[PDB]
């Protein structure tokens, strides 16, 4: 349960659901879906999401 | 004297045809460079779409690399 | 034949110009017909490219499906 | 690691090279890789493999 990992989870989460949605979403999108990803995974197990959203957008397009 | 009015039957003749000639080529003259214009807009058609398709195929691929299963 | 000299004259110039462009327009009929064949063929290239394209894009999707990373 | 664990494992392997070589690979090629990937699989961790190219082929043929 590092982090890091949480937010490699929330980068492949989001990844997939961008490109089963025809890479639809763009960044303000992948943003906004990054921190969501991100808080509801911090309750599962803040500046997180930058670095989630970052690499997916350097990963879509 | 007969060749002058067989001559003059055979001129409006002749120039029947070349009065049916220059139009019937004139126009095609249009079709063939209206059909050449389709083919490089056809030709940039598939540009667009094949370019258009290779985007998203290689986000699918960026996509498929990041779960990559061995983890 | 004064009268005949001429017509006669004028016939000569009127058939050195159909066999001018008699040819320039049968060439010209061809020309049509490979740029129609030409036209049809390349319309049919693109219809199967974009299916090629479409359906490698599922192909994508379905292995993307199976890599859930939530499974 | 049972057996699903291996079978399911390969599948998701299997359609992971089958789709970055550019869906290269056809029923017998596919076939091929899953008696590799099945056997490989019981010798880090039997007809199995049978499944497993049919679940592979069901996904990209």
């Known amino acids: 349960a590092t982090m890091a990992d949480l937010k490699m989870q929330a980068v492949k989460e989001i990844c997939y659901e961008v490109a089963l949605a025809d890479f639809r979403h763009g960044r303000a999108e992948i943003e906004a879906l990054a921190a969501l990803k991100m808080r509801e995974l911090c309750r599962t197990y803040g500046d997180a999401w930058r670095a989630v959203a970052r690499d997916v957008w350097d990963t879509v397009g | ?71």
């Open chain 2, 1 to 71: 004297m007969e060749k002058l009015h067989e001559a003059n039957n055979e001129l409006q003749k002749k120039r029947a045809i070349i009065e049916d000639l220059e139009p019937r080529f004139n126009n095609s003259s249009l079709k063939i460079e209206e059909l050449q214009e389709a083919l490089r807009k056809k030709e940039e058609e598939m540009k667009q779409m094949e370019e258009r398709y290779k985007k998203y195929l290689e986000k699918a691929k960026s996509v498929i690399r990041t779960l990559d299963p061995k983890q």
